[model samples]
Target chain A: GRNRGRLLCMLALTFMFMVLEVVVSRVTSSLAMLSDSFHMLSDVLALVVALVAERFARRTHATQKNTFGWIRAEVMGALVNAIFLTGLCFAILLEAIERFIEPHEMQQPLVVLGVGVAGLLVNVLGLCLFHHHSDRAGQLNMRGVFLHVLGDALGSVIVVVNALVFYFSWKGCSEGDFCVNPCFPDPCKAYEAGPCWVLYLDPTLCVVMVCILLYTTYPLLKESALILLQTVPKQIDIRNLIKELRNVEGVEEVHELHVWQLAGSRIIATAHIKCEDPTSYMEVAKTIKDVFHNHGIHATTIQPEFA
Target chain B: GRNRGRLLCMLALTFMFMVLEVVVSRVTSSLAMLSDSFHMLSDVLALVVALVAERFARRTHATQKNTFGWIRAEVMGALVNAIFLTGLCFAILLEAIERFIEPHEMQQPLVVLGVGVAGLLVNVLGLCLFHHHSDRAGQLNMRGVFLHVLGDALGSVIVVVNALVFYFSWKGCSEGDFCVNPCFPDPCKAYEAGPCWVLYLDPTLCVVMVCILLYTTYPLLKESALILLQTVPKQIDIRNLIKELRNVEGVEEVHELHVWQLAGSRIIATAHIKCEDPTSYMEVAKTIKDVFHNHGIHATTIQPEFA
Candidate 1:
């Protein structure tokens, strides 16, 4: 998970599995399988972003067209990604509800089960590939990828469970246009004879997966949106930073203190500082620098209005 | 379009026409009518944004959470709106292509014509309501609305023409399901009898309108994205601004100069200025302020790294 070789291999494996799962899901009309495919796609995208970021680190110089250059490109990309996935999640939810109301009696359960197990194997391979006795990734980005793969592995397990439960429980008979329960004519009679909940498990998993996706997607949107709008990063307490700055000797008051993200990790700060003495500029600037530095802010500008 | 009363009235007029045109377009199965309805909806959204800006001005005070407060809220909102419309434009484009490949025979052409003319009348009323003898708005936002209304008025005219051409040329016969040209059995014979080209005009206008929407949407995205990414404004040439700053007396060099929009009108700039003489800071600040003032940038902070 942390190494380039491992990441690349897992990327290739997930991609192949994703393609296979999606095609089989389409053939068998399995929502859970398709959901797993999309989940893999998310990892695929993240891996690409991670790998590209390795290359993207150099060219992001502040310049004429964009004074901050491409530093915040990731923030914008994340925002767009979250919005699109939110729409996709809604579509999944709606389709699940539709199938629940009139259940699509698990199509090609054997094929679905086959793909489901394959998905599980792919993820477990991912786990094994990424697993360390320490299993602790030092780099924050690598840590995210590790956790993401773990979640994906769990999702795969759910898909496998979904397929098995639905496949074994399916007593529905197939016809020219329909795969309906044999008790289509007499629903009450088959209540005991047939396990009615089996018919709904396909859509039920789709809804379940969508809920999980939404849980992740909302925080993604919130954090990225805040960054795009140039708000204070949630982790930094601006009031404390302000208090620390105000505590510096000879510093009168701080106003117009603007601090915002230039990118995910990079921040830019600006302020108007009223000082008791103009000669103390160097000392005050040094103290302000330390305060901001402690808060992990490097890019900064302060105008001193000295008495 | 600038006047509150006039803007309000036009908003109402467009809303009603948007509703009416969409309904009639559905009933008559006219792509052109539907496109016009969406176009009116674009104006509807813009008008709302304009009116809300009038209200959005008061509460955008810089805060601890967001040092820039909600100033850039409009930028984010515009980005989202542009993206949504871009998707909508794609949908319209696809639907038009679908219709062109197999035309939906004009149903209730009379209704289409009626709605088209009504759309035209509403836009003209928009023109008259917003039109001054000067017809030149002083405010930039007002002028945009003025230009936008004029464009909407022209689009309505096209819709009206679209309805007429399609209604007159609808020689297709109706049956249990299909509405096809009477000479469907004999294509060569009906080449002279039926004007086959006329059937495609509905989709043609849809494509035409989508092109126009794309033309506008791209710029909206471009400008908003640049702002969100803390890029230099398009109108302000950063090279020229940099050159101007570099030429200032007593200022040795400027580095880490960042200029970005806090809102549509408000600009925020920050820079590191290395100076030969620390005492000349006031004189240099005065000159830089004037330079930015002439270029319409107001809020700025410059840190002096004086030797």
Candidate 2:
């Protein structure tokens, strides 16, 4: 109940933040801030979709169609999140390139600074709400909050940098030029006089920022691809497993061996073994169980077949 | 014994043409004729490789691992042949591109014409040997020889086209310009003006040369991926299947059901059915079997439950 309540509260907070961010971005005329806000909004929506689907999955009765219920649903959501994050980074990179070609003036730096601080505060509160159930879901919720705070911190850093460059250029150009000769050539002109200090802040840095998103996403893509490929699990070596099972007491030979998993924690194996006699069935069964337990195979089905 | 005699005759004919083509290409000094001969050599080698492997596949179990032993040897041979054909095309393309950058002159036209007639005869004989068994492993052997003969036909076409161009352009150029003025430029001059005619051929058309190889091998890859993924068979619909089973005369409520395949033909469905009495198992089993046969499912098992 506590975990469920916390998740519900976070979902509410995230929706409110998305709405507020959209409203503030429009009022302040900040495209960069608006894009960043939209990314967070997408994250909130993805989480809501995932949580609701997960609830339904648990409630669903196992039907003849789907033996494993909807366990793949969570994996699918994680995959979509990774893809969306990568796409969002590319979209930001394209916008930065366009901005570099025709630089736009940002308005009211103080408003952005206030919004960034507020975002960081809300993210921390969200982090605290999930602290109790952190043991169950691993560090995912905490990590998500940390990433949001880090993103907001980056926005603040850009706002500060932009403010300093605008102030110095404004003061230096108007006051410095007027204080000197009337016809003096301004040193900050285009091309011949190196680009304005703002343009000197290259979009290549934004490209590098996008690369950071890909770097963080590499594990998510690689893990999901492995599951989708249905690769034999890394831990099970079928050849080694077969060889070991053949040496079990009361077994003459083992054939038709097959091993698969029931779930993450339960693995099941079946094999047709040529046993000495029907009287030895109880002894053979006990010995086979002991062998599997020692060999790290917790579940096994041994069929005694006549050769 | 009959297949071996036919293959041996093919080998002898290939050897005779190899020598004849080589002599003609050297005397004529026509690079196009020499390239055609090179392609013929690869076709001969591919045919011999395929015939030998298919023979090995026909042999009964020679070793323990050879159970169902020679059944797949033809597929193995075709796999190698495809790889070879694709690699050979890439090598020829690379050399052709380089030659287009710097070309040479033709020495004798009649020598190439004499060999081209002989080369066409040898390919036709090899075509007859592969055609006899085309209906049996028609799908497999035809694809193999198809690549082999198709390559030979392409070579013959090149030789004929080269002969015509060579005969006309032979006496058309002087020492410094060994090609006809305005009509047939010197090879170096041709290279300088435009690329060789061979380079203009679409790279996509390379697929035609390897179509047999791909057609034979793609099923192997597709079958492996499908089996490993545990995809439900395309024909059966799970919901509709269950509904039909529920309508069986003595059957009760079916739940906790699972349906999956062992092979393309065998489908195993297990379920817990609430039955009025355990003695009604035989009647229910017969009804389920009849339903499954109507739906093209060959194998099934049902576990009737009291609950």
Candidate 3:
């Protein structure tokens, strides 16, 4: 219930900033504001996915068909979210670079700075809200949402600083015709060497914001893709798992041993064990189950067969 | 060993056609020819995947990490093939329609016909080669390759027909532009409203070929995606599986049941069974294994527990 409330509050804050940032960027043609809007869009997606994951986490008496219930949905959601965010980051980088290459006249600096200040305050409130509602349960999905909002909060700070520079540079410059050197970079040649250096700050800060998001999101993308690819969980060692199964009394041979995660923190395993004594197979089966239980494999199946 | 030879021969045939088709399509500027070239490209991809799947099918002592061996690679390969083929189909359709709206001047009808006839022969040879070497083992990966080649064979027939129409229409029409009725359809208006209606056959046939491939490939995509999603196999009824397990004497309940396929026909299942009489658990386990074995589930894990 607390998670739901936190998610709802964060969702409302994200939408509020997303719309405000888009309006400000539209009026001022500010790359920094536009990229901040994109960041908020991804936060909204992550928060929604996290909420769905929390709902799927409730344990249920799964039917014979859905033995693992709907737990894997959370993994699929995380994977989709990662891909969407990666695409958004690439889009922002390309737009920022385009603006950098072809410098344009920006609109009123005061409007950009006012919107930037408002965005900073909203993100600070969001960071405080998420920190207070940090899940002690250590749910990976919830932690992912918290990390997403935390990263966006940092991005908002960059936006505010970019706005301050734009305001200060505009105040120091005067309108006049000035010739620029041909050897200068393309952006400099277009502005004709006037005191328009402030325009470069927007694209520069936009690039910086995009790089930060890319660096942070790369790991989440890789980890979620690995799970979707059905690779074994990195937390468990296959050699040690097999060795432990062999150590069970009466297990003459352990073959067909498999361990794969159904979802976050839910590992399932199955194995065929050949026994030396068929008469005492039940005792051996119990012993094998205990071994698996001790290793955090609660959902397991062990088949006992006589050699 | 026999299947490997068949796969190698088919692979050689596919690659040979792939290169020839690309060269012919480039020279002729024919939509039917270009789409046929794409068809051969997919055949090349399918043939390689089938060859890999065959190599993985050889029985070996898989370790704990890969209890199912490399069987699921076949499913993954099939899925990748389906997505690629779907995109190819859409590309062909769009190109065909584009050419339809703004018709291009085609070159050398004789060359188009000659190349089409050659492609038809190669595909016929490929079909006979695959049919004679039909795998009695009924491996799904091999079956997928067979279906892919079969579809391409049908596509070659369309290419040949397209070329025949283009050749005949060129002969029947004169190139002088005489004003025709404004009410005439675009293609009909092209050749002075003469009986050269057959020129429309090329792009129309291309669209027809794409539809055939899409219809045939849809099922493969659906089945392969289902396997990747880890859904229960359709052949085994979950209700019946649980019913049989419950019928095992001394078993009180069954929970955490999961049934999914590793690859083609290999079904793996895991369940937790609680027993009323702890001493008789071994007998119940054997009974459960027997039930699963009868239902073609050789890979299973049944955890027996006591109340």
Question: Model-by-model lDDT, in order?
Answer: 0.66, 0.51, 0.64
* Model 3 segments more than 4 A misplaced: A1-66, A69-231, A247-255, A263-265, A272-298, A303-307, B18-42, B132-138, B171-199
Top DockQ prediction, candidate number: 1
Name the docking class for model 2.
Answer: incorrect
lDDT digits (tens) for residues B1-307 of candidate 2 = 5655666777678777777766765665544555455455556667677677657656643223221234334543454454455444533443343334334444555676567657666766666766654323323544555556655655554555566665653443434533334322333231132234433232223334345444544553334223223335567677777788788767777654555543334454545455565456556766776787788876444444443
lDDT of model 2 at position B246: 84
Candidate 1 backbone clash number: 0
Interface RMSD of 1: 6.6
What ranges in model 2 sit over 4 Å off? A1-6, A26-37, A93-105, A124-205, A250-306, B1-257, B260-307
Model 1, residue A84: distance off in Å is 1.9
lDDT by residue (tens digit), candidate 1, B208-256: 8878777866766676666777777777778888888999997778877
lDDT of 3 by residue, B173-217 (tens): 235354442222432331343243554565787788888888877
Query: TM-score of B chain for each model?
Result: 0.69, 0.58, 0.80
The residue-level lDDT of candidate 1 at B289 comes to 85
Worst 10 residues of 3 chain B by lDDT: B181-190
lDDT of 1 by residue, A1-307 (tens): 2466777988899789988977876676555566556556656866675555434433478777777766466456556545555554554565565555455545576776677678778878877775751111123334334445655665666667776886666555443243444433433221122476766665777777878777766666676677777778777877787788888887888977888877656788888888776677888898888888888998789898765
Q: By lDDT, highest first, what's the ranking?
A: 1, 3, 2
lDDT digits (tens) for residues A32-147 of candidate 2 = 55555655655565456546534533433454444444433333334334444444454456556555544444445466556656665666676566444222112332333333
Worst 10 residues of 1 chain A by lDDT: A133-142
TM-score of each: 0.65, 0.46, 0.59
